[PDB]
Amino acid sequence: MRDRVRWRVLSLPPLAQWREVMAALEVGPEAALAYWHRGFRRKEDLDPPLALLPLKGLREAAALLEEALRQGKRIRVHGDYDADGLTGTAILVRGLAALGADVHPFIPMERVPEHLEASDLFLTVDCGITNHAELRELLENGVEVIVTDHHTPGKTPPPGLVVHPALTPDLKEKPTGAGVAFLLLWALHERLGLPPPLEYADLAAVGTIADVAPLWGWNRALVKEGLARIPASSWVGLRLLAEAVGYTGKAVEVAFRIAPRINAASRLGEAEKALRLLLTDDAAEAQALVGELHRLNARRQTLEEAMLRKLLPQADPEAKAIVLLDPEGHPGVMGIVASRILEATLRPVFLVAQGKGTVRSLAPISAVEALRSAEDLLLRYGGHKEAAGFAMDEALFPAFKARVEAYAARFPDPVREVALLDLLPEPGLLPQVFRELALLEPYGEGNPEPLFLLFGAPEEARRLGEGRHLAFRLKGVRVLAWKQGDLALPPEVEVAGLLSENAWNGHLAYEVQAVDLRKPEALEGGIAPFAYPLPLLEALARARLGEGVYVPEDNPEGLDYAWKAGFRLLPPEEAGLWLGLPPRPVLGRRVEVALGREARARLSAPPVLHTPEARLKALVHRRLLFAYERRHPGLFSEALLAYWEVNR
Ligand SMILES: [Mn+2]
Ligand SMILES: [Mn+2]
C-alpha cells in the first residue's frame, strides 16, 4: 500500500554512449538518459518505419484471401468483443468489402452450425488460437479457416491457417489482434498490387493501445501513424467519438477515453453498437451511436462505482490475497473493480459474481498459477500472470478462498517500484527538457512517461479546497499533488514527478505533477560503493586529529589551510579520507569523502554556459551534490565515476 513502495534511481549510462545518443538525437543529457533506458540510440528508433512485418502464415493467408475475393466466396469475420477485437474486425470487414469481397462480421461451438451455413471462409480476429475442436468447419463441412490472434497460444496451433506473432520465431514485435488484422489486409494489398492501407492505421492504433501492447518498434510506428489519422479519419464514427472526448492526438486519450467507451458496449451486452459505429459512413447514425456508447459507458461507470463501494471496505487488510464474493455483482464490471482494489492495496484480487470469477494480480503472484492451485474447484479457468478468469459454483467460494489465500502466503509480499530518471533540472532548463522528452511520445506500455526526483523543504505550500489537493515549491519549481491522507508536508520531502507544461490564459508554466510524495527515505540505485560521503565538519575534525588525508591541488586555499595546520597530507590512492575530488580515477580504494560547505570543491554548485555537453557536466555535478548531501555511497560513487570521465 505505502510501506511496500520502493523508489529507485535509474543507472547512468557509459558516458561514450550517453554522448552518442545526445549527438545522434540532438538532445540534452536528461532526454538522452531516457532514450538510452528505452533503447533509443539511433534517429531510427524514434521514428521507426511502418512496414509489413514478416509474420509466419501471413503470405498464405493473403493468398487465400485473394482466392476468396476473386471467386466470390463468402467471408465471415469472427472477432473478439473488446476494442482490439472490434477494431480488428472493422479493419478486415471494411478492407475486404472495399475490394469487392462478400464479407460480414460475427461477434461473440454451439455456434459452429450456423458459422457453417453462413460461410466459405471463416476469419477469426483477436482469437481462435486455442479453439481446436471447432476444426469441425474445417472438417465437418469443408469451410476454409483463417485464424489471426495474438493471445497466449496452446500446446499446439489450431487447425486452419493461423497467423500469430508468437509463432514467428525471432520476431521481437508484439502486434495485437487489430495489428494482425491490419498486417493481413496489408499483405493482401501487396498481392493485388495496391498501396499500403494506411487509412486503417487509426483503427489499428486504437486496438493496439486498448490491449496495452508494448509501444516500441512496429507497434510504436503503427500508433504514431494511427493517432495522427484519427482527426480526419476515413471512418466517421471513430472521428466523432474522438471529438466527443476532446481528442488532441494523445495515446493517453485513446487509452482512457476512447477505448473504454468502446469496451463498455461489450461489457454491457451491446457490442454490436460499438462495431456498427466503426462500420458506418453515415454521420447522423454515427452521432447517435456515440450518444449510445456514452450512455453505456455511464452505466458501466455507475455499476463499477457501486461495486467498488461495496467491496473495497471488505476483506482487504494485509491478507496476501483479497478474495470477495458479491453474488449479484455484474460480471461485466468486476475486472476493473478488481484492478482498482489491487492498486489501492498491492495484493492480488479475486472476485466472484453470478458464478463468474476474475483475477488481477501482481508481483511474484501469478494470477493463473493461483487458480491452478485451486483448479479442482473450478469449472473453467485460464489467464496469465496479471489477469485471469474462471467460472465456479459459488457454494465452493470459502474453499476457493483458503486455497488461494494459502497459495499467496507462499510468496513474499508484492512490492511496487517507482523508477526515477534523474534529479529534476534547474527551473531555467525545464522548457528545453520538456520539448526534448516530447519526442518520446507516444507513451504507454512500451515507454512510460519519465519521472523526475525533486527534493527539499516545501515552501509557499498552499491547499486547494479542503481535499488532499495542494501545491508547493521545491527549489523554485511548483509541484502539484494529492497529499496521501495527512496534509502538511514534513520538514523535507522527496517527490517523484512528471515534468508538465501547463497552459493557462494563453501562457505556459513548467511544473511538476507529483505521482508520489514522501518523507525522505533510502533510495535504491548507484553502483557497488567505493566513495562514502562524510560531512566536512566531521572530516576536518579527523584531519586535525591526524588522520591520513588527501586535499587536491585545486583550491590551494584548502591545501593551504591543511599544510598551514599540519595535516598528514597523502596521495588519494593511500589516504582513506579525502577532502576534495582527485582529478583522475582512483579505484580499489574504499574511502571517505567530504567536500565542504565553505569549501571550494563544493563548487559543483556554480551555474554554467549551457547548450553543449555543458549540460552533461551540470547534471553530473548536481548528482554528486545530491548524493553527497544524502550520504548515499552508491549514487555518489556512480556520479564520481561519471565526473572523472566528463573531464578526461
Ligand atoms: Mn480481445
Ligand atoms: Mn487482443
Q: Both 291 and 373 in a single domain?
A: no
β-bridge pairing 121-125 and 74-79: parallel
Q: Both 109 and 257 in a single domain?
A: yes
CA of 387 to the centre of ligand 1 (A): 13
Q: Both 56 and 194 in a single domain?
A: yes
Q: How far apart are CA 68 and CA 76, in angstroms?
A: 11
Name 605's Cβ contacts closer than 8 Å, sequence gap at least 6: 621, 625
Q: Both 205 and 323 in a single domain?
A: no
Q: How far apart are CA 343 and CA 169, in angstroms?
A: 35
| 442 cis-preceded (ω within 30 degrees of 0) | yes
Q: Both 314 and 233 in a single domain?
A: no
Q: Both 143 and 256 in a single domain?
A: yes
CA of 615 to the centre of ligand 1 (A): 46
CA of 224 to the centre of ligand 1 (A): 21
CA of 178 to the centre of ligand 1 (A): 9
Q: Tell me the residue range of the domain where 70 lies.
A: 47-297
Q: Both 404 and 375 in a single domain?
A: yes
CA of 201 to the centre of ligand 2 (A): 16
Which residue is associated with the grid cell 533510502? 522
Q: What is the CATH number for 457?
A: 2.40.50.460
Q: Both 590 and 533 in a single domain?
A: yes
CA of 126 to the centre of ligand 2 (A): 5
Q: What is the CATH number for 406?
A: 3.10.310.30
Q: Is 161 helix (H, G, I), strand (E, B) or coil?
A: strand
Range 378-389 burial, b when 16+ CB lie within 10 A, else e: beebebeebebb
Which segments of 461-555 does DSSP mark as H helices, in order? 536-544
- How many distinct structural domains can be found in the chain? 4
CA of 227 to the centre of ligand 2 (A): 18
Q: Is 319 helix (H, G, I), strand (E, B) or coil?
A: coil
DSSP 62-76: HHHHHHHHHTT-EEE
- Output the CA–CA distances (angstroms, integers) from residue 566 to 129, 540, 598, 600, in the order listed: 80, 12, 20, 20
Q: Both 51 and 41 in a single domain?
A: no
CA of 637 to the centre of ligand 1 (A): 48
DSSP 228-244: HHGGG-SSHHHHHHHHH
Closest-approaching ligand to the CA atom of 177: 2
Closest-approaching ligand to the CA atom of 180: 2
What would the grid cell of residue 310 be?
461495496
- 486 annotated as belonging to a binding site for a ligand: no
Residue 17 CB neighbour total at 10 angstroms: 12
β-bridge pairing 549-550 and 577-578: parallel
CA of 131 to the centre of ligand 1 (A): 15
Q: How far apart are CA 194 and CA 190, in angstroms?
A: 6
- 82 annotated as belonging to a binding site for a ligand: yes
Q: Both 80 and 212 in a single domain?
A: yes
Domain end call among 297, 323, 353: 297
CA of 263 to the centre of ligand 1 (A): 10
Which residues make up the environment of ion ligand 2, defined by Cβ < 5 Å? 84, 126, 176-177, 211
Q: Both 252 and 333 in a single domain?
A: no
| CB burial of residue 195 (10 Å; 0-12, 13-18, 19+) | exposed
Which residue is associated with the grid cell 463498455? 264
- Output the CA–CA distances (angstroms, integers) from residue 545 to 57, 538, 548, in the order listed: 78, 11, 10
- 150 annotated as belonging to a binding site for a ligand: yes
- 3 annotated as belonging to a binding site for a ligand: no
CA of 273 to the centre of ligand 2 (A): 19
CA of 538 to the centre of ligand 1 (A): 63
Question: Closest Cα to residue 160, out of 125, 127, 122?
Answer: 122
Q: What is the CATH number for 147?
A: 3.90.1640.30
- 126 annotated as belonging to a binding site for a ligand: yes
Q: What is the CATH number for 608?
A: 3.40.50.12810
Q: How far apart are CA 201 and CA 186, in angstroms?
A: 10
Domain end call among 271, 297, 323: 297
Which segments of 83-231 does DSSP mark as H helices, in order? 83-98, 112-118, 136-139, 177-191, 201-210, 217-229
Domain end call among 509, 525, 541: 525
Q: Both 481 and 610 in a single domain?
A: no
- 149 annotated as belonging to a binding site for a ligand: no
CA of 177 to the centre of ligand 2 (A): 5
